[PDB]
Structure formats: structure tokens, C-alpha cells
Amino acid sequence: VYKFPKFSKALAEDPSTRRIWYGIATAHDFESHDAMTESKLYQKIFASHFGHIAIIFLWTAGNLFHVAWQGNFEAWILNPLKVRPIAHAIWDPHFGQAAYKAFLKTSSPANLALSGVYEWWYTIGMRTNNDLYQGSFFLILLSSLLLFAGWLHLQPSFRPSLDWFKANEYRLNHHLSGLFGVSSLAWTGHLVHVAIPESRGIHVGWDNFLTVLPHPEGLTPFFSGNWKAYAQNPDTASHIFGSGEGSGTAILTFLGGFHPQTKSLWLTDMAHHHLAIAVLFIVAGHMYRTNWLIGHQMKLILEAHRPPGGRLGIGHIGLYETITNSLHFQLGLALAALGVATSLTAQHMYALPPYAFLASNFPTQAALYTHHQYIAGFLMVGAFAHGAIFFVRDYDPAVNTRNGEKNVLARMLEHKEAIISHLSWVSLFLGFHTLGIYVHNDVVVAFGQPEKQILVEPLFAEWIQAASGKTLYNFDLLLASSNSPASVASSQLWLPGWLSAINDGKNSLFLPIGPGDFLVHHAIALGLHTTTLILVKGALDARGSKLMPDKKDFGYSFPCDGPGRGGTCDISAWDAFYLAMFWMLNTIGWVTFYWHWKHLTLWQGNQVQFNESSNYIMGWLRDYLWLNSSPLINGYNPFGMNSLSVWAWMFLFGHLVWATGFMFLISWRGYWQELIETIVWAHERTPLANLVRWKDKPVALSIVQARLVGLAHFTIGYVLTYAAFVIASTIGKLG
Amino acid sequence: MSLDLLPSFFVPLVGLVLPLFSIIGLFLYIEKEN
């Protein structure tokens, strides 16, 4: 009953099971630990970062090793459009003979790989199960390096100080230039040297790379300035990927669009992209000042940025010390940027597939988009939660105020009511009218008169599609016109490739849109606005409100303030995160439902099914869920089973976890404490069991813990059931 | 010993033995005193 929460003496003195539960959930909140200083905080965070990167590299190495050992990578190379990639083998003693037979792939039961790693590794120039093994070996070596570094930087003479940790200019210069630019430069080097010849049949391994010229002229044009030579003779339109037939000699080109065979971006396009990004980031990494008297001091930049007329208060004067001294502000900024970035990855890796033969891998396309959108929602909610935490525990009004006037951040708490009221107005506006149009379509179609539907053509979005060259909406605007200056400017660089790809019905590049797209985009906007409303309200109201003008004195996460003053359930800022998690899950569900139904109709060919039935709710319920759930639920029946049996089991498992979350959310404490007391009496008053007694007094889960557990069940069930549905439906419908 | 015997050697090992020893260690640690 002691010594487990070593970091908290208050918990270690708890005589109940709450100590164990809270010991887990407070282990990473280093700022709240006993005998805590800032130096130890930054050092522990640094070591934890090292361990985390080691974990990531070990996970990647495991994926590589299991593809190399139990996969069919080599067979998939020779026939990427017919051979289904294998993730890893299965050894489960609970299998019957039927399950073994159904999951049997080649030599052993195995799982199909939906991560798209086969296409990614094939694109970057891997052709052998020994190339994957080398990658796994190297990644385990890198993990060992990172673990050694993490141990080393906790040693006495190697523990960095607060000044080093808060040295913003040095870290920015190095991160930008070194990390981004130099990693892009090295990736361009690999892309060219290995990937470009490997796509043309020439093997460039760790033996013949110092003697195989990536370009026939060989670094002469680069130093000579004749950089056009690297773009001459690109890959033809009859080039077979991985073979020298119809190949070229160029290494950096503009082509635009996709490879005619793999239906993916040109490797020479991506090498040029990464070279340009490398140059730009290396240049941008010299901005801030270091030991050589030139550069920028960001404190001065922030302080000097006050509009002269005066509408942002005193400007950004106090922001430097605010961000530097707070790890939650930086964490929130990083999480918001990462969420936007992974939303970008999801939205671009389906419209512009970058890996060979990934466009025809429909289950992996759906899985990748869903995975990245869910990660995006999680990251955004985390960014807002950490902003709220910064408000609660790191924000100092004195730093952000100069002689009564407030800086740009402190002024966000002055018109907080205006911000929240207008977020509420936008949410109500969008919800009222999107639901009104959807229900109008529902009722009108149900009454057998679909012509009375309200169908709004998304002209604004179709205008953008025409601006990028789509000649489908008869707009003749910028790139849909051959005479506009936008078209004449790039008529010789990348329009022929771009136009040939955007004006193609088999791509996902700028999918044609209609009224259903309009309505679902408005639903998405409503979801985004409502999630933002909850999170922003929790962040701004974190320090106090009218119901609790001292909420900052109770911390970020506390159960309530009691039944007084009318009742104060879910009044903390943590509860705002807890409520906004449901709205994030709902919004990501809407986004992924829209994407998956649109792409299922596109792949099956019945795009008229979406364009007609997507305007009313029953259309969704009947033609997406009810229609495509048939292959999934018949993964096992009283007659047999298929390789989709695991997905049906996961479907039911997700439903069960969802409803257990419903348990933990609807039923609150107090009802579970008295029942536990009855159980305690029963155990204490029964023979043959009195010999065994608990060391920690069994008590009901706390209010905040119960909310967390219900949210965890809700989210896990949500994710599992939707993953099972999307994967099984795609597999069982599209062969 | 072939490579295909490794799943049958490791999956029971990990998925049953590692839980047992991990539970023993974690229970002992969280039930300690001072």
C-alpha cells in the first residue's frame, strides 16, 4: 500500500485501490510530482523523448523484420496488382481446422498487410527480403543508440541545464536547417542514388553505390550550373516500374500528375521536391541569432510587433517569456501543427498517391485515410487540452500585461464571451440548417417525390476544381482555359502531366462533387465548429467563470465544485476535453464515412448511388452501412467462416466496448460505492474466504477516473468497430 | 530447429509466461511498504 506512487506521497498514503488507479494516470504528469524542480523536469522529459524515439524505431524494425520473414514481399514485387501483401504469420492455439484453412496464405496462416508498407518500401527501392532485414538491423541499432543517449543524458556530467533547454534560437536553427533541410537532402540523395535506378532496373546497393553514377554526366552539371541536364530524358509513358523498359536518365524533373503504370507520383518529381525543400529549409535555418553576431533575437521580433493604430493591445511583448517558461504552450502548438500535418497527409495521400500500385490497394487506402484522420482528431484535441492546461497552471497575467494594457494573448480572455458566443452561434446555425436540409430530403424522398429535394450545387468548391484545370463544370476559369496567364505560364513545365491527371475519371485527384458533397461538407464544418467551441470554451473558462470564479485554484482536472449553486457537474477544463472527445469522434466518423462511401462508389463504379442517396440520411443508413455491412457480418455464420471472421469478431468487440463505455458514462459513482460496500460485507462475513483479505480497501472509481474509463471504452470501441467495418466492407465488396 | 518452429516457441512463451512474471513483479511492487 506504499512505495508504488514513488512520485506522490499523497497517493502512497491512500488506503484504498484508488492509489493504484491514480498511480498509473499521474505517472507522466512530472510537474505534479513530489520534490520536483524544473531542471529535473526537462531532463526527465528529454530522456523520455529518447526512449520514445527508440520505441518508434523498434516498432518500424519489427514491421520490417516481419515482412521480411513471414511476408510475401518478393512475390508481390513480380505481381503487385494480384498478389495481396502479407503482414505477419499467425500462430493461435484456439484456431480450428476451418480457421487455419481460411487464414492460410502460402505456408502458414497470415494477416494481409493494410499498412501499405509493401508499396512504400517498393517505391523507395527495396526488392529483396534481405533489404528489409538490413533495414530492421539498422533500425534496431538506431534504437540502441537512442536508448544509450537517453541513459547518458541522465548522468551527472551530461545532464543539460535549463538555459540549454530554453535556448530557442539554437534549437530552431538546428531543427529547421539540420533536421528538416539536411534530412530532405539525404532523402533526395537516397531517392536519386537508390530509388531512381531501382525503378529503372539498375540495382544500387551498399556495394555498388560508390561506382554507379546516379546520372550519366555525374555531378558535372551541378557544379557547371547546367542544372537542366538532370531533367533531360525523363521516364517515358511506357516505362514499366522496376524495369529498364521505357526508362530514362533524368533524376530531377517537373512532370506533374502520375506515373502511367503505377498511377503514382514520379520518383524524379519527389526527388526534385525534396531537394527544393532541403534548400529552402537549410536557408531558413540561418534566421535566428547564435554565437556569431548575426541572426534574429525572437524576443525583439515579438516585442516590436504591435500595430501602431492599436488593435491587438500592446502586441506580443510578453509572449516570449510566456512560451519559453511553459511546456504546455509549446506542446499545444506542436500538437496543433502535427494534427494539421497529418490531416494534410490523409487528404493528399489519397488524391495524390505517392507510392507505386497503392492506388489499386483499396483496403489499404481506406485504412490509411481513416488512421490518419483519427490521429489528426486526437492530436487536435490534445493541442486544445494542453492549451487549457497552460491556462490553468502556466499562464501568468502579470507577464502578459504592461501598465494595465494586455498583450495579444491576455486579450483573448477579455472577449472570451464574444468568442464563445460566436462559436455557439456558428455551431447552432450549421447544425440547425444542415439537419433541416437533411431531414427535408429524408421526408421528401420518403413520400416518394424526390424532385422536391433541396440540392445545392457546391459551386464554390467546383470553382476551385476548375481553377486547377478540371474541365468538368464548364467554368473556363484559370487552368480550364488555355489562354489564361496561369496556363500559358506553366504550359511547358507541369500542366500536361497535371491536366492529364486531374481530368481523369479513374483518379481520386479532385473527385467530382455534387449536392451530397455540399451537405456532408457542411456537416463536417458543423462538427469542426462544435468541437472547437467545446475546446475553446474549456480553455478560456479554465481559469474561472461565473459559476466558479476560482477554478484555477482547483487545477486542470477536478471532479466538480459540489451540488451547490445549482449544481457543478463537469465544470473543470478536463471535462471540456472529455466532452469534446465525443464530438471529435463524431466529426472524424462523419469525415471517414463520407470518404469511404465516396471511394466505395468510385471503385465499384456506381458513383450514381452516392450522388443520389447521399443527400438524405436514410440514403446513408441504407446504402453505406446496411449495404456494405453484409460481407462483414457474414465472416462466420452457422454454416462456415471466411478470412473476414476476425473482422466480424472485432465488430462485435467494438460494439461491446462501446456499450461498456455507456455503462461508465451513464451510471455515476455513489451507486457503485454502496454496492462495493455490500460486496465488502459479504467477503468479510463468509467462512473459508475470511482467511484472504485485501491490503487496499476496495472503493468505487473516482468521478474523473470513471469519466476517463468511459471515454476510453467509448473511443476504443468506436475505433475498433469502424476499422473492422471499413476493412471488411472494402475487402468483401471489391473482391 | 527450423525457422517455422519459432512461432510455436515464442508465442506461448511471450503471451503466457511474460504476463505471469510481469503480474508477479507488478503486484509485489505495488503492494510494497516502507
Binding site: 514513488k6 530522456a47 527480403n129 532485414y133 534496431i140 | 527450423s2 525457422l3
Partner: peptide, 30 residues
């Protein structure tokens, strides 16, 4: 198909990475 030697040495290297992990874990304290 990878050999027994390839898998064996990868397992041995994985063990070394495990001993480095507990050293980091124990250094991050109880």
C-alpha cells in the same frame, strides 16, 4: 527466405537493445 543465422543475430541484437532499455528504464528511476 532469411536464414537461421540472420534471425538469430537479429534476436541477439534485440536482446542488447533490451538491456539498454532497462538501463534507461531504471535510470528514469522506480
Amino acid at each position: 527466405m532469411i536464414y537461421d543465422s540472420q534471425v538469430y543475430i537479429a534476436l541477439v541484437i534485440a536482446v542488447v537493445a533490451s538491456v539498454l532499455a532497462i538501463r534507461l528504464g531504471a535510470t528514469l528511476y522506480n
